[PDB]
Design an enzyme around this catalytic site. Structure first.
Site, mmCIF file in Angstrom:
data_model
loop_
_atom_site.group_PDB
_atom_site.id
_atom_site.type_symbol
_atom_site.label_atom_id
_atom_site.label_comp_id
_atom_site.label_asym_id
_atom_site.label_seq_id
_atom_site.Cartn_x
_atom_site.Cartn_y
_atom_site.Cartn_z
ATOM 1 N N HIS A 283 0.832 -1.230 0.000
ATOM 2 C CA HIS A 283 0.000 0.000 0.000
ATOM 3 C C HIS A 283 0.851 1.258 0.000
ATOM 4 O O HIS A 283 0.474 2.300 0.569
ATOM 5 C CB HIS A 283 -0.902 0.041 1.234
ATOM 6 C CG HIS A 283 -1.946 -1.025 1.257
ATOM 7 N ND1 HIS A 283 -2.198 -1.791 2.381
ATOM 8 C CD2 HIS A 283 -2.822 -1.437 0.309
ATOM 9 C CE1 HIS A 283 -3.189 -2.632 2.117
ATOM 10 N NE2 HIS A 283 -3.581 -2.440 0.869
ATOM 11 N N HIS B 255 -5.272 6.987 -2.825
ATOM 12 C CA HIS B 255 -6.296 6.115 -2.263
ATOM 13 C C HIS B 255 -5.827 5.264 -1.066
ATOM 14 O O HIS B 255 -6.673 4.832 -0.280
ATOM 15 C CB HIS B 255 -6.916 5.201 -3.343
ATOM 16 C CG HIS B 255 -6.015 4.100 -3.802
ATOM 17 N ND1 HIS B 255 -5.026 4.294 -4.732
ATOM 18 C CD2 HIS B 255 -5.981 2.782 -3.491
ATOM 19 C CE1 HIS B 255 -4.394 3.153 -4.944
ATOM 20 N NE2 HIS B 255 -4.967 2.217 -4.214
ATOM 21 N N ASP B 256 -4.516 5.031 -0.927
ATOM 22 C CA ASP B 256 -4.001 4.226 0.181
ATOM 23 C C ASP B 256 -3.427 5.069 1.322
ATOM 24 O O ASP B 256 -2.757 4.550 2.206
ATOM 25 C CB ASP B 256 -2.964 3.231 -0.335
ATOM 26 C CG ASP B 256 -3.574 1.905 -0.774
ATOM 27 O OD1 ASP B 256 -4.781 1.649 -0.475
ATOM 28 O OD2 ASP B 256 -2.909 1.054 -1.408
ATOM 29 N N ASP C 182 -6.502 -0.267 -9.994
ATOM 30 C CA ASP C 182 -6.024 -0.733 -8.711
ATOM 31 C C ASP C 182 -5.514 -2.180 -8.758
ATOM 32 O O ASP C 182 -4.533 -2.509 -8.100
ATOM 33 C CB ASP C 182 -7.176 -0.631 -7.706
ATOM 34 C CG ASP C 182 -6.701 -0.613 -6.277
ATOM 35 O OD1 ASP C 182 -5.514 -0.293 -6.075
ATOM 36 O OD2 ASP C 182 -7.450 -0.935 -5.310
HETATM 37 ZN ZN LIG Z 1 -4.628 0.141 -4.368
#
Ligand SMILES: [Zn+2]
Length: 301
Positions: A80, A120-121, A217
């Site tokens: 991540h 997003h992480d 993703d």
């Molecule tokens: Zn991701």
């Protein structure tokens, strides 16, 4: 100091062309690149999507924002980490360019998708496996960095542009929750299998943006075999170690085949129906399934 110097390097560096950086390729790697090279790639993505010029982003502010995002990824597990987020964004750029999804989206949507892919992480002790249905992403840290002095890449937007962009960013980050992908994908797959899929309505648009976030993703699964095998092994090691190694390695083929069948294959099939130029994502996924399945069978001796 560490902080000031990274910025000087980045801001004064020549940003090579998209062509030279290979970021238009679905097959793009990153293994060999330095963090500075990924930052230059990221500047190029913003530039060639016309984001810097259409939204009046200041060069040094964009550089500082990229470096703040990378810095905030430092304490994350590797799967991540900044490299994963950067890869997610590069897949978005490739899908927009080579996959010709750019023509189907607005400037605000493109801006938000790029920022979401990258952010997003950012989430602010055992960690869940990569892409677990139990993960839940948050947008709080993304917004905090965006509003931080010297990092305000959305300063050029009108208040109405800004509020809409933030709403799409939040949706797109929340879309990386695999549980939400699984919940909503049936409606997507059904609209397409018929022929009713329509980017016109606010709802089918939000839904398409979410499916695209998922597709980017998970896109390590579409990479040429030597890259996918490598990532999968690293990711597995990162979780399983957070006859030892044998026990680990022997699990991986069935893991990947199961994940492709349950989660990936149908998504890249559906994406290809929306844009036939996203075909290489599907093709790469299919080839990796073939390779992992042959390994699962050869491991049963
Ligand atoms: Zn991701």
């Amino acid at each position: 100091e560490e902080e000031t110097r990274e910025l000087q390097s980045l801001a004064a560096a020549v940003v090579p062309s998209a062509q030279t950086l290979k970021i238009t390729d679905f097959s793009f790697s990153d293994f060999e690149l330095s963090d500075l090279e990924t930052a230059l790639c990221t500047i190029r993505m913003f530039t060639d999507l016309n984001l810097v010029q259409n939204f009046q982003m200041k060069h040094e502010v964009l550089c500082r924002w990229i470096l703040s995002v990378k810095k905030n990824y430092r304490k994350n597990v590797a799967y991540h980490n900044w490299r994963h987020a950067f890869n997610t964004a590069q897949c978005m750029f490739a899908a927009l360019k080579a996959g010709k999804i750019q023509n189907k989206l607005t400037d605000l949507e493109i801006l938000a998708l790029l920022i979401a892919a990258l952010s997003h992480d950012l989430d602010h002790l055992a960690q869940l496996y990569c892409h677990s249905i139990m993960e839940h992403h948050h947008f709080d840290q993304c917004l905090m960095i965006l509003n931080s002095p010297g990092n305000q890449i959305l300063s050029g937007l009108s208040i109405e542009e800004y509020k809409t962009t933030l709403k799409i960013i939040k949706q797109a980050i929340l879309a990386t929750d695999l549980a939400l992908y699984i919940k909503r994908r049936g409606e997507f797959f059904e609209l397409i299998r018929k022929n009713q899929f329509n980017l016109e309505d606010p709802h089918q648009k939000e839904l398409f943006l979410a499916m695209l976030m998922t597709a980017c993703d998970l896109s390590a699964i579409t990479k040429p075999w030597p890259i996918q095998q490598r990532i999968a092994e690293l990711v597995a090691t990162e979780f399983f170690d957070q006859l030892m190694n044998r026990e680990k390695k022997n699990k991986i083929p069935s893991m990947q085949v199961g994940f492709i069948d349950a989660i990936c294959l149908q998504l890249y099939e559906a994406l290809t129906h929306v844009s036939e130029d996203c075909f290489p994502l599907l093709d790469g996924c299919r080839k990796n399934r073939q390779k992992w399945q042959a390994l699962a069978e050869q491991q049963e001796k």
